[PDB]
Amino acid sequence: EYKTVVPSPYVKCCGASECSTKEKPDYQCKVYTGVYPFMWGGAYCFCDS
Amino acid sequence: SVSQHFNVYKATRPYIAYCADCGAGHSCHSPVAIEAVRSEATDGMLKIQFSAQIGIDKSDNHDYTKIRYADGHAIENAVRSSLKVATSGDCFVHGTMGHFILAKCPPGEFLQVSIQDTRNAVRACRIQYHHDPQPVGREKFTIRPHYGKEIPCTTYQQTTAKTVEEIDMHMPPDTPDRTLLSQQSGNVKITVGGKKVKYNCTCGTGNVGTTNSDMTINTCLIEQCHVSVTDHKKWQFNSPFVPRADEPARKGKVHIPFPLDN
Amino acid sequence: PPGEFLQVSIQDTRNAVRACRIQYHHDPQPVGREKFTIRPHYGKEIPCTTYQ
Amino acid sequence: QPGRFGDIQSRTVESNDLYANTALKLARPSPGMVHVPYTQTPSGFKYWL
Numbered sequence: 001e002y003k004t005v006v007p008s009p010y011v012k013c014c015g016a017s018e019c020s021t022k023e024k025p026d027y028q029c030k031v032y033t034g035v036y037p038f039m040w041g042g043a044y045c046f047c048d049s
Numbered sequence: 050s051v052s053q054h055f056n057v058y059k060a061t062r063p064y065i066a067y068c069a070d071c072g073a074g075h076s077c078h079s080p081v082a083i084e085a086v087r088s089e090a091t092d093g094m095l096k097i098q099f100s101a102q103i104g105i106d107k108s109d110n111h112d113y114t115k116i117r118y119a120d121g122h123a124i125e126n127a128v129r130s131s132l133k134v135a136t137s138g139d140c141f142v143h144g145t146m147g148h149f150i151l152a153k154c155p156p157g158e159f160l161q162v163s164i165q166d167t168r169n170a171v172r173a174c175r176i177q178y179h180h181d182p183q184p185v186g187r188e189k190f191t192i193r194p195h196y197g198k199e200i201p202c203t204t205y206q207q208t209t210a211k212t213v214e215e216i217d218m219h220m221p222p223d224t225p226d227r228t229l230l231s232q233q234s235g236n237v238k239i240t241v242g243g244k245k246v247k248y249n250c251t252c253g254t255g256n257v258g259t260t261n262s263d264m265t266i267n268t269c270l271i272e273q274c275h276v277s278v279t280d281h282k283k284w285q286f287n288s289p290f291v292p293r294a295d296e297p298a299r300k301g302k303v304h305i306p307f308p309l310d311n
Numbered sequence: 312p313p314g315e316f317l318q319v320s321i322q323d324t325r326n327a328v329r330a331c332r333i334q335y336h337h338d339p340q341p342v343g344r345e346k347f348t349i350r351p352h353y354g355k356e357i358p359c360t361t362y363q
Numbered sequence: 364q365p366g367r368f369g370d371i372q373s374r375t376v377e378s379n380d381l382y383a384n385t386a387l388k389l390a391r392p393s394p395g396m397v398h399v400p401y402t403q404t405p406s407g408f409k410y411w412l
């Protein structure tokens with residue numbers, strides 16, 4: 001039996017990110033644009049979109 | 050030594066995560082959010098991982114009757130005689146250490162872990178986990194008989210010694226806060242509160258940086274600036290429910306308790 | 312939770328227990344096409360009716 | 364093949380290499396939240412057992 005390792009997501013405010021491929025079994029990475037994360041205190045970044 | 054066994058735990062702190070159901074079907078932010086459940090042993094001894102640490106006080110010291118949990122920006126303590134685990138009935142807690150609870154439960158469908166607060170409130174987190182045990186052998190019994198046979202099986206020991214299995218440790222990210230702002234006539238006053246604060250304002254020019262005091266910025270509205278706590282000298286567990294800091298590198302390793310034994 | 316009967320109990324001034332117990336066949340099926348029990352952390356929004 | 368015997372493969376117990384095929388798919392996070400949504404066919408070893 002196996003397990004799935006997923007690290008904490010990277011959130012970048014007022015910028016752009018691009019992930020490179022690594023040599024790991026069934027490695028899946030993706031980048032999503034237009035996010036407005038929230039936390040217990042408040043908004044995470046000024047940048048709306 | 051037993052007190053010496055938590056030498057690594059002097060460099061870790063609990064956290065607050067996102068619990069989908071915390072008692073009344075309302076998604077909330079909880080200090081006892083569950084992360085994963087492991088049931089490798091054929092005995093049926095569930096091992097549960099959750100944010101709150103058991104066995105350490107706020108003064109960063111060994112104590113077996115206290116549980117330290119994150120609350121706001123600080124760390125509070127709760128009595129250890131007020132921890133409940135339930136699947137369909139009241140379970141039985143066998144062992145605890147730090148991030149992990151080793152217990153046993155009757156058959157059910159959902160797993161719920163509850164603790165008490167300083168104000169005598171109840172903080173609980175409940176997830177779905179289809180659990181039913183089948184004992185080793187060819188008989189589906191429930192209670193150990195007083196005369197029978199011995200079969201090898203796998204269980205979890207209560208020894209807290211060092212083990213191969215490890216968990217990762219990462220730098221906690223900056224937590225935004227909006228209770229550190231005040232409006233006075235036509236200016237915004239921000240308070241240190243004893244922690245480093247990173248601030249970014251849009252009004253004016255050159256109103257961005259980091260501070261450790263109480264400042265006032267003139268001709269600025271309260272919605273025009275963001276402040277965030279940035280000290281975070283301790284280490285936090287790498288969880289998918291919290292954002293990752295700027296550094297994408299591993300920061301530490303912590304040995305897991307309760308290995309698997311025959 | 313699901314069950315066959317219903318009991319409602321309070322405490323008296325003399326610290327006694329006063330309870331009533333009736334039969335009511337309760338088995339709630341969540342709306343939609345999935346028979347789940349716990350709300351997930353990722354899914355879809357579907358209209359439903361509740362008590363305010 | 365995913366969902367059946369042999370989803371996770373290894374030459375030996377101490378081998379450092381591994382072959383994996385389990386159809387790990389990522390999804391876009393829900394608005395106003397921080398999390399990573401992923402869908403994956405369950406382990407074939409448990410089903411075979």
Ligand SMILES: *[C@@H]1O[C@H](CO)[C@@H](O[C@@H]2O[C@H](CO)[C@@H](O)[C@H](O)[C@H]2NC(C)=O)[C@H](O)[C@H]1NC(C)=O
Pocket residue numbers: 014015046047249250251257
């Ligand atoms: C402080 O916040 C401002 C926005 O309120 C950030 O300025 C943005 O920077 C990005 C990066 O090029 C630009 O694309 C945006 O157009 C800028 N917004 C505005 C309104 O000018 C600024 O980067 C933030 N600074 C820090 C240190 O976080």
Ligand SMILES: *[C@@H]1O[C@H](CO)[C@@H](O[C@@H]2O[C@H](CO)[C@@H](O)[C@H](O)[C@H]2NC(C)=O)[C@H](O)[C@H]1NC(C)=O
Pocket residue numbers: 203204309310311
């Ligand atoms: C159950 O007992 C077996 C037999 O001793 C253990 O399996 C052996 O573990 C040692 C560890 O040093 C290996 O060198 C042997 O190769 C294993 N035997 C076989 C046949 O593979 C097993 O570890 C015990 N169970 C647990 C949970 O410890």
